[model samples]
Target: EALVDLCRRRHFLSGTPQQLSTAALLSGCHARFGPLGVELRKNLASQWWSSMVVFREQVFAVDSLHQEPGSSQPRDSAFRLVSPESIREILQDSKEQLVAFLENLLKTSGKLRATLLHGALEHYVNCLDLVNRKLPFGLAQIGVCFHPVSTRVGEKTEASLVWFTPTRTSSQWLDFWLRHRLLWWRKFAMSPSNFSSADCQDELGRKGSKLYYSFPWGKEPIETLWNLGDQELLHTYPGNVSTIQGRDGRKNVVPCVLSVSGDVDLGTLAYLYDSFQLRKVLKLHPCLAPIKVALDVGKGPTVELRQVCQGLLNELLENGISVWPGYSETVHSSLEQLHSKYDEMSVLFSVLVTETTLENGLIQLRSRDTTMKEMMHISKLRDFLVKYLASASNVAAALDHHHHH
Candidate 1:
């Protein structure tokens, strides 16, 4: 009911009973399957894996084991558990006394069980030390993280990930990650088609700093990026160190931590989806668009024309391309229906199969954003579509890189 109210306020829900009901159903599904939910997760993971793991030599990937406390095979057994009351009392002590207390506590407790992440970070550091890497190397991991505060009901935890790097100086490492992470997010999630430069902003927080991005239906900024300084991490986990020395006489330490929320809330993505649907545009990046090409044989077509369209659709589907099949009463109505219905269906390319063109082994390809048409042989259709989609993807990449500077 509240969601319907919100949609009504946002102008997404309206009209007859069936219309409002359909809008609610779409809103529910978008939370699970829309851009900010699944598609954004996939894109973020893919980009991070490619840049930090596949392409870079200095960075290594680790699949951190998820072991909650009291699990059957707990990995956190080595960590010393400290209660919230204990932490409060420790903070009340003098700085020197607190340091001395931590030192003494470390000797007996082995390591403070600061949080599940404390153990995870400790394990990551140990791996780095074992590999004997030089200064300024990094470790990247994509996994789940738990938080005390729930972002909303039934979402106490989030799909979280981070790339940690030790550097020669705090300023250099901090500056590098801050710029790159924001650029990466912009590349995957915020494009000119979806988000404007005015949507991005930065502000200081009590614990550290935060970055926010505006969505189409947003009433206020949504916090999407976070940066944690060395002091905060050290203070949180007293058993950890912030500095180290390499064999080359370079002093390096974990200067700061960069974290991006792997799961963006569905509301923002749904807003973008609705906005794009209303405007007849693809809200997602071309690569992330669910259905890339749609094939339609306009109404009252001959059997031969239908066969050709079906065969083309089959071939595209077999090749792992998403395709939609549409048939109407006439070629004109078919094209009209395709344009009218394709946006709501979230399809990128609409191919109108005509009888005269089928006889010549050609078809008209229409892009989502433009009314322009191109005639191409059926034999080269797949390659042409692939190239066009790739070009669209590249344009987005270039735009993101250009804005990063």
Candidate 2:
């Protein structure tokens, strides 16, 4: 009720009856999932694409199936031969049972593949021939995945996609993946000071590693990595080989496979939310801000005030900026109300529209971070925001780069 009242006073819940209901529904979703749920997912995908696909060479995006056809075979025919070591490692005391399971699956379904890894490996192998010019290249994919638990209702089985790279050396590729994955997580989700990497054993006691992010709630791992040596690759796709030349001047073949899995589950998101100290309503990254800027027209609002605010809002929206309607009243009270409900960081600018300022064609523009107010022509508002936003982004990028180094 209080939330609705606040939203209503802020103009967020105002509109037609249907619109009000819709706004209430959206607010409920945001409250349950955190305000940045959709924005976080979108930003995560964008960051992954920018880092792994857009700016890199030899990385191609591909759409893949969630399940491989039952009739399908391994990418390379020679993969038909199962590796003795792999069999022993994966099935310690149940090798016979494993064989029986495989046979039964193939007999009943004509094949034994039905997992995301199976489909990803198939696409990776098929594209090998297409990108024969590059050695040690990767295939990037973003898709839905299924797990045994997902058979139950309301369970989510989707996963963060991968940069499946078939590299020349196991150690080199493992190091590369570990470094890159950690850097990516640090840059976007949590700061490096809050996390540490360590070798951790899985349920089977096999050696692996994980990156743990520390939060006020507690420390939890955000990602895990496993080194599947050459034998595993040979077992999965025996005849496949890399066409690119290695450091030793020989055609490099798949000698290593590493898997890095990340999660955005409730726990993960909660940890991130706490790690970033995002408890405040407005505590969000700029990219994740629901509304970038909120304009407050001081009290005793006039017709021209509404016109100017509407025009500014329209212009901002057309340029891809997210904004919300401003409220009438004194700048002090408006700002107080805004601060009580939102975070200073989330709001880039807080403009006070007034008639007196119109004489000079300038309005009071306040910096949310510094509480510093300045006079600027209304005409240059868009340019000012673009320039400062870009500058802020650049500053953040530089800080992240420095921290990584």
Candidate 3:
């Protein structure tokens, strides 16, 4: 009764100070709209407040996606455009159902009420609703959420999503996807304790594969290109093809053949060197956009793509754009000095051994007992020299020229 009296006083007793001094204190005691009106207003207000809380929680859960480095693939994950009508339906229905659900829990006040109290019912239903809408593209490919085999619940699935349009090249998509994955692998490698499965806190924190599309450029039939290989970017991303010219006025894309021959060490260096060479190819490609390509350089174990990429990135820190925060402080004092004096020299250590083999190959060719196989190998060496020399000249020219200029 005290609570009711307090509500009645706050709602009805308050009046103009002038009137309050003249009229009897309880003059406004009669409820204007009767008790029914007051009860309706209170219920409506409660429902509005509850829905606001649920909205806040859902927003927080989705916002966590931005914290993920690879989440760039799911740029539109927050958008729910599957069906205009369905969205309206869900929003209205969910709010009403939630109101009912909360009301039910409030009245039950018994065992298993813990579910509602713990925020489980609200979040669980919301999570399911969210996945149903946002996961269409992902579900279309590799069967809902990239589960490799079996329909068993909660199995290990691919960790990252990839998105590409048919306008992109197969090589382009593969390179981008692999590099993205490799980058994650490197990050994982560096601080396994920080991001590994064992330490992850979120329910979906485990690894997952994202979706990349085919024929992604223009408005094209997604079904027609769905089965296409990822490397075949010619079809997937054609419309989105870059039309801008590179720093050099030349057609942004340049294709050059690379040949590697020499001692095993030199061959390995050549393979590693080509990885960097691809960067130049990408920069020059007519496709004004940038892309890195990894060519198939026969079979060899000495050169690992992952290690080579890491080395190249390390070299780039000293040479190319040094925008990363960690590099800022150390750049001028240390990294800059190291880069200026001997940045590419790390590759040279392997090059020297290879060059020695090249010298040896020259001698063998000059000797009286050289076979055709040996001659063929010598030709391969000459081809590599030509390619490397040309790449060096272009790189040197590039160094002298700045995009800003």
TM-score of each: 0.62, 0.67, 0.15
Regions of model 3 farther than 4 Å from truth: 1-154, 157-160, 190-405
Scored by lDDT, the top model is: 2
Give candidate 3's whole-model lDDT: 0.24
Error of 1 at 179 (Å): 2.5
> In what order do the candidates fall by TM-score, top score first?
2, 1, 3
Model 2, position 236: C-alpha lDDT score: 61
Error of 2 at 70 (Å): 7.1
- Model 1: how far is 205 from its true place, Å? 8.9
Q: Candidates' lDDT values, in order?
A: 0.50, 0.53, 0.24
- Which digits, one per residue and each the tens of the lDDT, describe model 2 over residues 174-247? 56666776666665443556656787665654455777776444566666777654444455655545432222
Please rank every candidate by lDDT, starting with the best: 2, 1, 3
Q: What TM-score quantifies how close candidate 2 is to the native fold?
A: 0.67
The regions of model 1 sitting more than 4 angstroms off are 1-31, 34-53, 65-67, 70-122, 129-131, 144-153, 156-161, 166-168, 188-208, 216-249, 252-256, 260-262, 265-280, 299-306, 327-334, 399-405
lDDT of 1 by residue, 238-316 (tens): 6545443233345455545544343333323433443353344435556555567877774335786778888898898
Error of 3 at 201 (Å): 35
lDDT of 1: 0.50
